[PDB]
Amino acid sequence: QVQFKLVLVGDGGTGKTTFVKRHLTGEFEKKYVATLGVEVHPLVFHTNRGPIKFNVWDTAGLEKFGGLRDGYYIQAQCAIIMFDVTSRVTYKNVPNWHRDLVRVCENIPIVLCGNKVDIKDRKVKAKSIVFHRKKNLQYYDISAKSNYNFEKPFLWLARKLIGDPNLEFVA
Amino acid sequence: SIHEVVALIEELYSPHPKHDVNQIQQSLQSIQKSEQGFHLANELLSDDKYSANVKYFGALTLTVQLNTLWNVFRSNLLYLTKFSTLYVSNPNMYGQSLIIIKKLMSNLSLIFTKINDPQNMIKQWNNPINTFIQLMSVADQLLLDSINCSLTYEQLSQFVSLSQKHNELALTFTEVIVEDLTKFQTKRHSMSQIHEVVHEHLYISTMALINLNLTAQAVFNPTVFDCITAWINYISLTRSGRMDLSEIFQNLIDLMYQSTEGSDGYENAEKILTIFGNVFANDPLLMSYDLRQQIECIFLGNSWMLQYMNYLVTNDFFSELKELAICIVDFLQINTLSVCNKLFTNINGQVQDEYIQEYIKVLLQMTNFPLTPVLQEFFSVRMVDFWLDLSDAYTNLASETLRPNSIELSTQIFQQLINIYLPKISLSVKQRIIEEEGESTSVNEFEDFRNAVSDLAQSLWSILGNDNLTNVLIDGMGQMPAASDETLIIKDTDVLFRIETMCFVLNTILVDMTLSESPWIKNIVDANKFFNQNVISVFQTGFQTSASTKVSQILKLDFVRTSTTLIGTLAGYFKQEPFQLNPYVEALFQGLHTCTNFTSKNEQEKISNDKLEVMVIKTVSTLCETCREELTPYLMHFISFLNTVIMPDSNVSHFTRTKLVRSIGYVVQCQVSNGPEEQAKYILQLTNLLSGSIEHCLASSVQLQEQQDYINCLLYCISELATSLIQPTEIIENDALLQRLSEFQSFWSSDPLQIRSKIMCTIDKVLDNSIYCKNSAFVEIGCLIVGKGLNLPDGEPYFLKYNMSEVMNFVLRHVPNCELATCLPYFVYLLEKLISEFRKELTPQEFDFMFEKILLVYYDAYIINDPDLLQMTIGFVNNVLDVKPGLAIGSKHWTSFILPQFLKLIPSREKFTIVAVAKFWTKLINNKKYNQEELTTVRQQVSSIGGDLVYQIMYGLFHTQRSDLNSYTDLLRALVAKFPIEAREWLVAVLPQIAGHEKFINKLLITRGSRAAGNVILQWWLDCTTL
Ligand SMILES: Nc1nc2c(ncn2[C@@H]2O[C@H](COP(=O)(O)OP(=O)(O)OP(=O)(O)O)[C@@H](O)[C@H]2O)c(=O)[nH]1
Ligand SMILES: [Mg+2]
């Protein structure tokens, strides 16, 4: 099997830990306990060309709990930035996380994820998002509570990291 | 110990580590800070043998100034020193060693912002560029002291750019500084002090360096571009002192226009276009009018711009052409109001007409851009928004200022506009997209494009009207047979695509209309003999399509979708002219019969079959919603067809079963010309059918997934029947019912046919089965059925109107047996519907009864640690406060349970729980439905728990984040609005439990009264966070 380092960043809340927990166990955490520094978890996906595993570095969004902060980004091979579509202030810090990532890993693939689309009091609309300019960067509406675009940010990553737009993740 | 530190640093960054990287990184966090953590970074950076990751971890460990006043100097000294080491080693090298330099730069930015900050050491560090740049000219440690705020000559500045990497580092350093200042500004609002020292030293030398890079050959370095954008984004957030950028914009224009294919392959062209697009999309007034007009001349014109566009289209650089188009549209969209003024109003007689009509001609000419949309060009795509804004500007002009030719010229322009866009949104375009890319994201962008064009056409209706838009679409579509052959299959693909796009835009225009206020639609369709025939032939052609390829499949779905939605919207016409409805009804049911008896099992053609089927049934139901009186002759047939497909052994879908029942119910609802008994005959037949099918399914087989889905289908059929039998709230011609109102009111109040009892005995049999009562889906549909008759207009003779007891018995029979965490919200929403319906009859004893049985007994083992259910209970109490507050105030659980529990939930960490409890307390304080006794008692009660309450608030803001601060302000503010005297009595005791600045807010929160808190609050939170 092949292994890839993913770093998961974004402001506190937004749902990074619940995202990786839904991918790992199918559980949906309703309560918010902020992470302290990082948590590293393997996620294996099955597909053609054998399985591929992302070891995911769920970082802390609160700077009070940042831990190593930039140190987690070293040797990173892909990144996921995440914001809360119900909290516009989380979307305004997206370029902050983006430059913090690319100042140590500039040409790596990064997926931008608007979480919590299931909440229909949505305050950020997809036409407002413009960070799909470059090719090493992609946007997706996702919801860790609704599984909407569940494992699509990992599909796009995988496709660019191995170099084939056709994997589809067989179960 | 340094060797083992380096060891586990390397092990942190290894691909296959042991010893658990989580514990490794925790141990690394333990090392910083420490007695030697600072010295550790020292020895980690100064030793040459350490690797890049290890040196960068050292640079990171230096960042712990967030862990009294002179160790700041020590760390500053070390940043400068290691900075100089690693930046001298950079020029005589090639690559790989830049990220550690960047980190040292970022930390020097943070130092820069700590020293130059309010709140005999040293106060000044004015120009980090000068400080940085005097340190290659170099008894030793004494230098750094005087080099600190040392002035640099602009000649010696230029001397440093003797090599190219020196220029790179100098530009990158200002870039880093303003990027970190931008990050700090986004998070934190306490830097209006440092923006002036940046304005007054760093700005000048930065503009000098950027301008030298832009004007001097042989020293230019593309990094300047990454620098410029930085300083743009930094200047945009400060204010939209004034930092200029006008000369930089001028030189960027000049450098762009010197970039050609032969000069540098338009590299500088695309870079400066990205910069200008950033400016135009986010802060366009940052560029002055003169420079914007130079840009306007260049964008619109042998001309440079044209020679660039061809360069993009011959080499198929469609992505770069797309981003060019985005930039140009964002530019053009700056002066839409002035263009609208200089065109249509009169506030150089025509030599500015000769200019602006040419302007409009080349904007139309650019919109029509000779390439296929989304697949090649977004010029037509991206400035649907320009034309939308221009039409909105025209329609919003003052009626007394328009030119005499305004109507005519606007009609000409915005009509040639639709002439342009109709071929652009042809399904032939989507066909080609999926032929060359398949079901990519380009088709999602194409759908977005058609929807944007449809919104544009809706906007243009107010300018063009029916005479110059809608009648054009209907006339051009209704004077010739698209398929004169009586097969009614449109045989030519081109006329098919054309008529489909026309149907699409006609639909979009027709939905904004209520086709009953005007006989226009009947008058215009009567003048077009082939209109209905062509609509039906579009439907038939699309739906009899031999879907050979998946391209043809998705296009078939598109054609039938367009045609069916058009039929559904023409329903209003059909009501004005019913003798045209029968062909549509016959075609729809013939196609439905085609769907159902279709048994060919490709398994992926049946998904398309079911999509076609649901489209068909949606449109027959939308026709029945409006034409229910005109469809009476079909009723007996519908009921018969329902009987042949309601059975589970049918190839119909459950959703079509439900929509068919709903449409039948629509037709039954208006059958009031006789007594209520004849209509109740139909209703009894339908309810017996549905309930008997449910009971047969429950008794005949084990309830596997098939049987569960069928039970769900039938419960939704009952719900659709109940919904379709609700009287339409709008008054309709010849009610006839109104002559018979009393005798329906007396009939369904008695319900001799026992419809309500039958229906809820069915629901009970479903939910008394263990398999279903634990299923929130079926709990939901049952609660919906029980709640249809609630909150309807008083006196409406609605058949399924359950009284209060009947409702609660229901919930009382089924909350002990359901899965609470998933099912209880539906019961609680039904109880809220109940208490809204019966608000004037309810007593606090009945409120306590339903609050105890449904919520309080389950609060600890199921609710207290479940955010959804907790927000549910808070919303229930809030709803009772909205409706009839004395029910909760007079409750025996008010002081006992509600106030203490909602008092504890204030420092919750879930944002919606926070906003729910804040809503609770705010409405408790600000409820205007109180009588004076209730108000007195509520003030007594809030005065009793006010100290605990204000503690819980301040306890929350101490630990919560900036996003959920506002949710507390509205709460806290409320207090000082109503209890200003106790407030400080409560503040002086809770603030020391969680010094000067505290008293500050106490003097400035109560002084404000209300409305402008929060601004007073965060300046407190920003104080009491650092410590
Ligand atoms: N409605 C909805 N809520 C969600 C969704 N995803 C997460 N949440 C909620 O949002 C909160 C986010 O919590 P976390 O996942 O721990 O946030 P985080 O990214 O780990 O934040 P930090 O630990 O501070 O870095 C949780 O309480 C979830 O209940 C979602 O997709 N939809
Ligand atoms: Mg987390």
Author numbering:
A (entry chain B): 8 to 178
B (entry chain A): 3 to 69, 78 to 129, 137 to 155, 162 to 263, 268 to 328, 343 to 388, 393 to 1039, 1044 to 1076
What does the paper say about this structure?
S. cerevisiae Pdr6/Kap122 was originally identified as a pleiotropic drug–resistance protein and subsequently as an importin β superfamily member. Furthermore, we found that Pdr6 imports Ubc9, exports eIF5A, and thus, combines functions of Imp13 and Xpo4. The transport signals recognized by Pdr6 are folded domains.
As a first hit, we obtained hexagonal crystals for a complex of full-length Pdr6 and the GTPase-deficient human RanQ69L mutant comprising residues 5–180 and, thus, lacking its auto-inhibitory C-terminus. The best one diffracted to 3 Å. It interacts with an N-terminal region of Pdr6 (HEATs 1–4 and 7), as well as with a C-terminal one (HEATs 17–20), and thereby pulls the NTR into a ring-like shape. Furthermore, RanGTP changes the curvature of the Pdr6 superhelix from a rather open conformation to a closed toroid. The ring closure is not caused by a movement around a single hinge region but instead by subtle changes in the packing of adjacent helices all along the Pdr6 molecule until HEATs 19 and 20 contact the loop between HEATs 4 and 5. Our Pdr6•RanGTP structure is indeed incompatible with Ubc9 binding. There is a partial overlap of the respective binding sites, i.e., RanGTP would clash with a bound Ubc9 molecule. We assume that Ran has to put the superhelical structure under tension, and this expenditure of energy could explain why the binary RanGTP•Pdr6 interaction is of only moderate affinity (∼230 nM; Hahn and Schlenstedt, 2011) even though a rather larger surface area of Ran (1,938 Å2) is buried.
